[PDB]
């Protein structure tokens, strides 16, 4: 098997063309057979199962996230399926158990899974909606990457950027990865031992234009607490949006569509203190139409988390720091520094007045692939 040393992160890199990536993602969904389409929905449903498994083993899950408290079940499921591509023996087996894909072995068919995740990506944007995923494989200087592994990540996303980097100076390493990712994407990012020789980071950007809405001129006060308050630019739209008021669990849900299959969900607790408990009831394994005038904050959010913290209860840190065998990734010594997910989430522009001027929960769902693309919590629209 041939190899190659990732170019040093300081080398010239042309920026990624998102509009060219979107055309590719739509092409992927366009040429999907019936079996591949069901496989995409299947993997979207399986990523949800993993996501719900992550909310059950976390009382306060959001101390894991740096910045905006947004979470991508599809990206977490893809980062694990991507690492499995380079795993062997015990490491591969333990990763396979976490994914729980009920398909016949080709070991798990990592190529079919990753190609299914890119399918749920293309299904969403093929309907205004912008979803982009790029993977950065950051390695110590001189570490040899195996070609079949890099080429298989391209099944997850056409944009794969392997670069070599000096991890000895660590605080500078985190700046170079951010200064590199922002220079090549134009987004905002965040990141965080000295033995490390590999950092496998997924960076995804979502931009959702809701039609029928508009950015109001004057801001409105957003109450982070009953004591503290901040003014925020607000979106405003009116239409027949699905809704439901849960009197038993005292919370209300609003579903405003993006497309025929993709929608945004908004869980508003009746009282502010119920936020963490209302979250437990919703994010875990009934709406009807109503004329609603929705007013919610314009969301320009950025956050990041290490899967080793999300899946600490699944012993992922042990999977990646004990008996490690990523020898399909590289023959050289691998010490995982971070397994990152960095999310740039943008939400931009008789009667029931629904106003999100208090902490709320949200989610982006797509019925095409029955996939929770994003779960999140907005205690403060500004960060």
Residue numbers in the entry: 31 to 136, 141 to 161, 169 to 233, 238 to 330, 338 to 401, 417 to 450
What does the paper say about this structure?
Human blood pressure is mainly controlled by the renin–angiotensin system, which consists of several key components, including renin, angiotensinogen (AGT),3 angiotensin-converting enzyme (ACE), and angiotensin receptors. Renin is a highly specific aspartic protease that cleaves AGT between Leu10 and Val11 to release the N-terminal angiotensin I peptide. Cleavage of AGT by renin is the rate-limiting step of the renin–angiotensin system.
Helices A, I, and J of spent AGT, which are involved in renin binding, have the same conformation as in native AGT. However, it is notable that the rearrangement of the CD-loop in spent AGT places the side chain of Trp133 in the hydrophobic pocket occupied by the scissile peptide region in intact AGT, replacing the side chain of Val11. Finally, helix H in the spent human AGT is disordered with no clear electron density, whereas it is in a helical conformation in intact AGT. This may also be influenced by crystal packing; if helix H in spent AGT were ordered in the same conformation as in intact AGT, it would clash with the CD-loop of a neighboring molecule. A reduced stability of helix H in spent AGT could partly explain why spent AGT only has a relatively low binding affinity toward renin. The binding affinity derived from steady-state analysis gives a KD value of 13 μm, which is 640-fold weaker than the binding of intact AGT to renin. Therefore, we conclude that spent AGT does have a product inhibition effect on renin cleavage of intact AGT; however, it is unlikely to be significant in vivo.
